[PDB]
């Protein structure tokens, strides 16, 4: 097989289009139930909250897995990290249910102290088996100059989670409890600096903007000041790409080339 | 000295062919016995194969270390991981045959969990000391969207093992024991987006390939009609490089550029 | 806000200038105090050791945080790691004292053995409230190839826990032991392949070198013939992107730029 | 309350008696489904085969959980781990046919190398709240001179993962996915120097030792002639201390005895 | 020395009195300031509330370090354990009023995850380097089946901790910002089977009651049916041994007997 | 077998005599290489001075293993542990050239932080592998009240390591570099309350102080002066189990009684 093409741009285009089946036309349209995995209460909303809404609107049905508590998101000296993570657990129900998610997994692992480690794969394959999501969202680990471990753990977690709930010898209790093993049909990552597949939110970006301020804790209008301006030019970045006002972006690769592929790249 | 040089573009030339005495022409030309490290069994044979059996061919002795026992490899309910590993130590015996390769330690740490620690580089500086190779082949760990933890971190247990199995008071109780500090001639990194030295494999590729599907585990038909289009797709890449129909490629680098050098990427 | 701007090109110039105040034409002008984040002894005066005396000169207090103690850095079978540390504390003080630097903190985790832990971060942060600097600098964690873990956690722990010493909940003894929040003016990465400001140390090379030497046990005669050609072609390196002989570089950027920020790599 | 006693031995009476409704007469005897938890294949044989045929017989269902694969049980240098993990699967499957036992949970964490944290206890309350036993069996892990750690570990995990799955923010994604909290009934420690509880298992002793010996990988006939001088030592231990052969031995206490409690070695 | 005595019993009575000057008749008399450690929030109320009131009395200036949050301490499925971590914190605050303390120390680790390593060691030791206590209570780690891991490692943490805190090499940044090593006077652990010393509570015994209701959380009227009966159980225990109604119990022994002391026992 | 025997007390004697053939009588009379464990510079000669100066002078050869590089013994602030350490191991080699002793294995862990792990076994697994020494000698762990983590450690990974040195799937890299699985013929525990053999040290004692006082940077004149007395007291303790002096006492028992033995403790 393959003997017949005669160059790698050949070869590449045929691999794609015929092996694989990819094509980032309209990626999303098939979804049913999707998973939208943030490092931290606000990130769905922050990185795809536009998106969402699209998404909740046609039918499908959006859920979260939140990994941290945000219990360290504060510079109060008088408000603990307790008081906090409540505090912030009310203001996601707020956002979720102006953007028509309907429910949030906590794992609850501290904010700024998420593991990279097999226990919290073990939590996020758990639920993909337990939902069947079509579809998982996560953030680019590969974003360039990402500092917060939480963010970079959080996107690497749920790539390795997603190809790992495939197999029956990982997380073998879930097998023997009745959880099967699950086989999602496309990842996103948001928070990218490459994106390949741009949505328009043009219309939406004012709710998108309501959803994230609903964070009252973290969006002081001190905060705002400066936060406005950074996701009104991050949205322009995205829809630029397209020739709109405003849009959220996503890459989207076939499950092959997360791995051994040197020309992952070129798309 | 380097005071009478005038350009950066004259000092790096300078360093690299004088002070480094580096170059590409043939780096595998003077090796008598090498290390290929592999995360899984048969990832040797899928990343540099044909490289392999053109170096047994010579009269190189090829030796591989594999880090874990590819436990986590299939999709069958009733297949454990437990008898999976045991089947992929005699489809790596088969396939390395094939390509000339007498001799194989086995880590065994489990597929999906092959650790980044000082405990695992000891192992390898053990056998790196025992075995005094001239070159030591592993996977780039800086190859864009690699997403499967047991390959970026056996990239980088390589690349650190090498360096720290010269140091006398890194694992001192080989010292100890009459496995003296060993410096080794080359690294040379597979599975890379960034090749500098392509291996003309064109009339080695059928073999490549009856090596790969030894490991029938991993490579049933149905995989198959998948993987001989990337892997025929994968070999073009590297051979267009130099004007071949299939390569392998490999990143060399002197042992400087790996630390501290701002312009690595310059070769 | 950020509504009247038309193209992302606009915006992001206007959220540099305006919301961010981002400028790069003197970045260290008002600098009182500054600490300088090495990962073994001698880094900071390889990597930034002009930079550190035309600080010192102008009365910026320089304080050093050494994160090991150098106890791999020798080839010597009859030298313990043990005393090479003590040699190499005693060659980084008379080094330092050429450079003008009075204060080394040293964190004395072994070489090679440097955890990426909250425990790293929390002596970070415990030595930032202390000490109140204006600046901070630390490895480019991000430079291409770089292959040892200690360099490249120092870089990501020096960021994080600049970032976290502004959060009372993280490590929260300190607060209540009465060292309070501090927040840095700004992070300089050093070792950088992507730097953004560069300080001419054409007058201070022989200097610098000198400094470097002070730590004799590193750079013997013999590896100094090849570190002499290296450390001359880095500093061209940078020199020439600013049009002078002898430079050092780094990178700096706003603070949000280190977190979810498609566009970082514009500056 | 307890104003009106006098002495503490009225108090720890009364207390024992009324408010915690001890008693070691029948212990087992409301039991409709009990786990037994073992270290490693065949010490829930070697423990305590002989009440488990009892408990089958009354129409108990026994549930065994083996923490570990038993890869490191051989001297044969050409046997693997891997090898010997299936082979020993089969050995418990025949043992556990003999004595009644219809389902085996395999955690297959290896043999030597159980973890003492949170992720092992969260895969025992997994199966805790799914099976819903109302006994627990597991090693008492205060055995004198226990050498083996994952025979301490085992116990003390299975006694604090009892505890926690009553608690619904332990493991807290096992409620969301609909698993609910369970209150265990009884704990019986078996492996035991402090006995309070002796089943009498004279007549089913060759049944016992039948059971052990299909793990014949361990119980070679060389082995053996230490082995069954052992058990049978070890069965008079037990039986002597009420009047019997051969007995197995148990501890079993109030739960609160099993935390802060000054006089749990009263019982 | 120690020449001249004939006998065991002879030299360690000359080894406690006068070697050790070590005497049990009044342990606690010359404190200024002590530092009393709990695992969770009710612990120091619960195994010393008397004896905190007596030293408050006093003019002894009583300290809380709590090790944890008591994030796990509900059944209620709708209390998360952020929120039961917020009351908890109100409630000891409540409780602590009660018996005149003014200052709690909160670790914050969450309740079931307590670490046992060097980083929970730090902070331990900064608090005692801060404050120069000349007494420290904590749990015995050695009360026979304590179950809880907290518990057990609260009290192992807190003994080394005084050991350290001594050692200027260990956690040598508190020495560089001036937190100079300490040494404590005595340690005294409660929650203990063997007790030499036992203060008489019979008067404040409802004081103390109280001072474990305010952690109402944990105390509701269904549980306080058990725990009242078992509380004075626990209190009797103690007195009977002087000759009193209700007892607290602490063990003291020289700072020699916690290492390498075959005869601890013996007192 | 064994069913011909009556009572318990029968079986316990048979089982000891007859099939395990222990006795207690001279147990290190055929060694000819042991290996003495110890966690710090200094406590070979502390727990075992006499003894090691008694095999060495039967010809025995006797090597030690220390787990610990001493770092952290000191209370001058002036001292760091770099120095510290170079210091105790010169200390180390005068002691035990004056017992006799001409080969010491570092394995340099820092003190205070050496870990319970399976990479610490494998550096004691190497050592058996390679020395193939008929005795080890190591810490009681079990020894009550003993407070510092290295010493606990050591007697437990002392205990596990002579039993996985007989796997072979142990550490199995030994194995392919030629290190045989090696069975040690008798463990002894030093540092015990529970001994069962003493050692009569009476005309040894002022060589084994002095031995210890060789260690001078741990025994100074003021800890010399409750140094002394301890010692004496201990070694008193010991020989007036037998009606001697001055004795060192040890635990030996069949390798059997360190798993699943009940009556371990009746020897
Ligand atoms: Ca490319
Ligand atoms: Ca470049
Ligand atoms: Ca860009
Ligand atoms: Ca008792
Ligand atoms: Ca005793
Ligand atoms: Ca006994
Ligand atoms: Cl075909
Ligand atoms: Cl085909
Ligand atoms: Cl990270
Ligand atoms: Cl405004
Ligand atoms: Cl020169
Ligand atoms: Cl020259
Ligand atoms: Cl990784
Ligand atoms: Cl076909
Ligand atoms: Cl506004
Ligand atoms: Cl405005
Ligand atoms: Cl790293
Ligand atoms: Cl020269
Ligand atoms: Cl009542
Ligand atoms: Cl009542
Ligand atoms: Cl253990
Ligand atoms: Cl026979
Ligand atoms: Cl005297
Ligand atoms: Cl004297
Ligand atoms: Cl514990
Ligand atoms: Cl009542
Ligand atoms: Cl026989
Ligand atoms: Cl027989
Ligand atoms: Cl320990
Ligand atoms: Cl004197």
């Given at each position: ?85 409540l505090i912030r657990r ?172 040197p020309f992952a790249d070129?798309?």
């Amino acid at each position: 097989m393959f003997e017949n093409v005669s160059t790698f741009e050949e070869a590449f285009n045929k691999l794609l289009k015929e092996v694989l089946e990819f094509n980032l036309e309209n990626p999303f349209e098939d979804a049913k139930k999707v998973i939208c995995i943030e490092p931290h209460p606000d990130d769905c909303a922050i990185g795809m909250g536009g998106t969402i809404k699209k998404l909740s609107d046609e039918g499908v049905e959006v859920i979260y897995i939140c990994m941290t508590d945000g219990y360290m998101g504060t510079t109060d000296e008088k408000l603990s990290g307790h008081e906090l993570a409540l505090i912030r657990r009310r203001e996601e129900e707020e956002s979720a249910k102006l953007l028509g998610v309907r429910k949030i997994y906590w794992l609850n692992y501290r904010d700024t102290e998420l593991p990279y480690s097999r226990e919290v794969r073990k939590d996020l394959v758990k639920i993909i088996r337990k939902e069947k999501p079509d579809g998982v969202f996560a953030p680019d680990p590969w974003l360039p100059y990402e500092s917060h471990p939480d963010h970079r753990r959080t996107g690497f977690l749920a790539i390795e989670s997603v190809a790992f709930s495939q197999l029956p010898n990982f997380s073998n209790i879930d097998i023997d409890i009745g959880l099967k093993p699950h086989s999602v049909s496309f990842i996103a990552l948001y928070y990218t600096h490459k994106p390949n597949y741009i949505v328009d939110i043009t219309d939406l970006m004012e709710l998108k903007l309501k959803a994230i301020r609903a964070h009252r804790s973290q969006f002081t209008d001190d905060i705002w000041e400066t936060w406005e301006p950074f996701l009104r030019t991050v949205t322009m970045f995205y829809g630029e790409k397209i020739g709109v006002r405003y849009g959220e972006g996503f890459r989207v690769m076939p499950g092959l080339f997360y791995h051994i592929t040197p020309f992952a790249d070129l798309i």
